[PDB]
Ligand binder design. Sequence first.
Ligand code: NFU
Ligand code: SF4
Ligand code: SF4
Ligand code: SF4
Ligand code: SF4
Ligand code: SF4
Ligand code: SF4
Lengths: 559, 345, 345
Amino acid sequence: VEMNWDPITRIVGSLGIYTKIDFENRRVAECYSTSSIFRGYSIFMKGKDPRDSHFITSRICGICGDNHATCSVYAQNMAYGVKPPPIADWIINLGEAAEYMFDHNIFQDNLVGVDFCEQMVRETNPGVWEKAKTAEAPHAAEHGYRTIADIMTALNPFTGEFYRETLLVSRYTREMFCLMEGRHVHPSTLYPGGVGTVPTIQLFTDYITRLMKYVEFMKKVVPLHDDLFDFFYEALPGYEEVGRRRILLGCWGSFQDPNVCDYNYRTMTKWGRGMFVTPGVVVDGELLTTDLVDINLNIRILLGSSFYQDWDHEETSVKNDPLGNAVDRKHPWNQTTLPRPQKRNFGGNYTWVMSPRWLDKRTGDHLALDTGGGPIARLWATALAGLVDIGYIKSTGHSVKIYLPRTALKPEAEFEWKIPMWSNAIERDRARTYFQAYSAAAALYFAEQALAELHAGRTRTFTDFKVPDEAIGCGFHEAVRGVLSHHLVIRDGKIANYHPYPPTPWNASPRDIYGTPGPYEDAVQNTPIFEENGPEKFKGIDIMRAVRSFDPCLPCGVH
Amino acid sequence: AVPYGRKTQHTPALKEVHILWITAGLGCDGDSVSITAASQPSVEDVVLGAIPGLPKVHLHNPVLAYENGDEFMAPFHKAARGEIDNFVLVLEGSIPNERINGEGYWAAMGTDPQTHQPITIPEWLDRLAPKALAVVGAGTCATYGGIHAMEGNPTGCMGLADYLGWQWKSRAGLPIVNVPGCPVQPDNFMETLLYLLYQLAGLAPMIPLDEALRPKWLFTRTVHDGCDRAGSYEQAIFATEYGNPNCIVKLGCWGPVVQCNVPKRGWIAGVGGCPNVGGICIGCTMPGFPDKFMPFMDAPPGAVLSSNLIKSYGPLIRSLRKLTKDTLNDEPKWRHNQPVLTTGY
Amino acid sequence: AVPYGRKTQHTPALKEVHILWITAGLGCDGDSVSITAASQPSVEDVVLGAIPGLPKVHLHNPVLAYENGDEFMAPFHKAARGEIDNFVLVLEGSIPNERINGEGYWAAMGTDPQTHQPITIPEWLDRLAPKALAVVGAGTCATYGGIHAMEGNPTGCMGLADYLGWQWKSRAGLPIVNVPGCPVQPDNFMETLLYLLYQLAGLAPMIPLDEALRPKWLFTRTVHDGCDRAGSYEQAIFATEYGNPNCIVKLGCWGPVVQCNVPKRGWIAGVGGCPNVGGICIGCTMPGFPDKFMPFMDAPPGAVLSSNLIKSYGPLIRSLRKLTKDTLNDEPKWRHNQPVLTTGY
Ligand code: NFU
Ligand code: SF4
Ligand code: SF4
Ligand code: SF4
Ligand code: SF4
Ligand code: SF4
Ligand code: SF4
């Protein structure tokens, strides 16, 4: 049966999912994902002043742009050989934490939530609604909803009590964000070498005051979502199978330590570790790298199924890294984007999204590493590292301990996210909620550090720099949806090459030359069909719940 | 049972309205994401009809919609046929040049069963545009082409005016409505949409736009006109490094020549901003954006002339302010705890 | 069952704190009513300890107090008996001169348990101030005497520093903390109060104050340095009547020589203010208030000078910007739906 949905709504950008599904066996045979928008950032960025990168790259996406700006400012910092004042990177962390808090919350309860709301469940699984009404939520003591069916109704678009509330929560978290970065989603106060934000006791007062409100909100929302997700695991035994794949997770680190980070490629190994979200490839249940130089060098962009001509006969610009290592040709630093507009055909050429893969030195495999969301990839990597000791966040090895102190109306709370044993759709969505507590927890620590710098009197926020005539640069940063890299090249004082690679590019990619599936495809293929409808009226909610788990973002995906 | 006072409730001239939102233009979905930050009025305020007397609003926006895929597109395709007589067209993202192709597409939404062929944005436009009540531009991309109409771009894209004509009027006499910004300032768009819901209902006059088709009450005054760092400008005190609280014109701010209300209005609930909080204006709400502003972190040449200007009287007019501020930081003589009153009583 | 995170929670230096709020000064309680409007932090935020690691707060303020009459004054009397050590004394209103009496009183709060007479404000201060951990003046009345210490006032009243002495210190070393404003700006006070809660917990250095005992980070910069009409000031565009969107210095504004953050900060949640929304600044946060500012609606003497001078380069720079803005309202030429691309690619 040929069932396809395009454009897919309640995601960012124009996505299309075309599939072959076996009803009689309740299985998905094939699958093919496709974008329809190409803008060509790598193209028109060439020849521009390097200092303009973070402003321009921010427009890559309307929901995560601050991540590109940050990631871009990281790279220029490297290229220009400049380290911003310590208080400036605390400020940038506080900003990015708010970005997590905002994005995951608006997406979880207003975009993917609709997939779980009453109206949909009563159109997809009229039986499950009947089941849902009699299931009492295990944590009604913490979130006041008596039954899973009540929670579900609370998610109906615009009418649902919790639906309407999270809109409010997305506003004051954006306010928070704006205190640190000026405006959302495209920052105004971010620069290479520091920020323009004026550090005052007021600045951090207005942030902490709003943060405390987000913290208490999470004491309600963590249990609220565990109960709704634990339900589907109990309501439909085995549903774990939907949207699962091998543990092929990428995490390129998050918040950074001005105590250690000087933004040099060499020392990038070290302060790569000490990031308050430990970077690493996890595969699979096992963890390979503590080093970004390690993971950086192994990145390859393949092209088996994309509308480009490939840069075989295009001149390389970077042969070695700043530490002498060898650099590949299909690596972003040496990439050249030739846009080839052509008719769609799922036999070979059917998406503007390139096919990034990773290289295991041990095995010689080019696996389609994914983010999953990717708060899922993030949490998994950190738990293993056992390297982050923030108090609010603590890594044991088997898990990560998120602690939220007493607010005005609730007492303490701790949320230990244990490795899920599985990488599925639900556990992703489960992870997204847990990371919101992570962000809120982390943000509490950064506010401390910042206030020290302020009380110490060290309030310079910008360190002057000079644009080299010849330089390279790499930016590593975990976006909302997962791993984000920014590879910059400077020749004749201008941008010779610039390629941003957000998390979506991976997840939405098709199969490489080796033919390995696109991270949606493998997850949407292994996906069973626990649905209660046959093709005629069938809307296919189970595949949608799978793609939306990855938290797709097609502007990031094609750029 | 019909309560006296319902007589104050007058039915809108247009009972309902459909908002066809095309986000599949060349751009991010920043203007869609942005408007969910509004409060004056909020996006749920408008759908749930919090302000009575306005047309019933149906919002067809991909990012939020309940319908999916082919069912979501159904209202779009219906309007194309002329079946819908109450839709306003909102474009977000720039219009790609499809003539430079070809057997492919730069941007599209709705794969079509007509031939299994993806529709291009230019096809959608002049298919829906001449049947719409109004065409709204949401974001500097859709209005003027924006960042994606940059020098050296592959798509050769453009704004709604470029494509339709700067004198193009809808089938209801409404010129193109341009709400620029990157992204659109939340309240700005919701203020404009609300204004259109008022005009369509019959309660307001033709929306006052300017020569670039921008809402006059939002885009007339310049950024500098509303910037609080303008004091330090007059006193010839200019920031040497980013992070300083004084004027940053020498640091990249084009504020004196850009038409935007952010500094005066704030970004969200009075909180955000650009130069008023240390972020240089890069002119993101202008037609010339971004090419006529880069490199961003360079001083605008015009500023260089006016900055270097010698204001001789400067340091002494700065003196009496000091001298005057000193007489004002001391209490009158009759405030004391002495045995006798000395106020004048 | 203690979790690892508990190690992050530290016990405040001072376990609990009392705030004795004497409103019985020559005031109007506007400063009290004002802080209920705050949100950064809110009053109920402090009272419920929204921010961890701070001293438990017992707020004794008449306007909100559950306790009534004699039960409300209990902790006051007990603190003057030296039976309370961790209390902060806040005063709101002017301090009267009870030395020109006489039988009777200008102002009293509690009742003497022995003499059974009303207790005057000076008497309360002598018993409480030298025992207090800190003495905070809330409003211009309590800081500098304010509107009630006006020329010709019958009570001959004054502010804290006048009564207690400008170099007065508590028995914890803290100087008088003046928070000017009529009324105090809502978040201004809660931030000062919040800072003091941080200090007492040993989480922050001594409260930085200027020579007038005002918090530095709040009252250093003038009204003018934060006025979003400063723009029209630099370009020499002054309003001549009151509903006018430009500078209003010619109409009564003292902003250039008044130390206050209101226009920059907004009144409540960034919404209001004074000259920034068309209300002249009358210097209600200054020692000289109100006498050195009257009449209010007459332009300050120093203003006549300033405005005239900069009428020189006003015209040129204005036309420079108007012409430049013209160029910026024109799109780049490479935006069009022609058959061949002309972008550069
Ligand atoms: N989060 C996020 Fe973006 Ni619209 C993605 N994928 C990227 O950097
Ligand atoms: S104007 Fe800006 S926010 Fe809007 S679509 Fe364009 S790049 Fe995105
Ligand atoms: S920072 Fe910009 S808008 Fe502000 S006063 Fe200066 S040049 Fe003008
Ligand atoms: S950069 Fe300028 S035009 Fe753009 S939102 Fe900021 S102040 Fe407005
Ligand atoms: S400072 Fe003003 S608001 Fe406060 S008591 Fe005095 S007159 Fe009232
Ligand atoms: S209205 Fe007042 S504070 Fe504002 S710019 Fe003018 S004189 Fe200054
Ligand atoms: S009159 Fe002046 S000092 Fe008083 S609140 Fe207004 S701006 Fe502040």
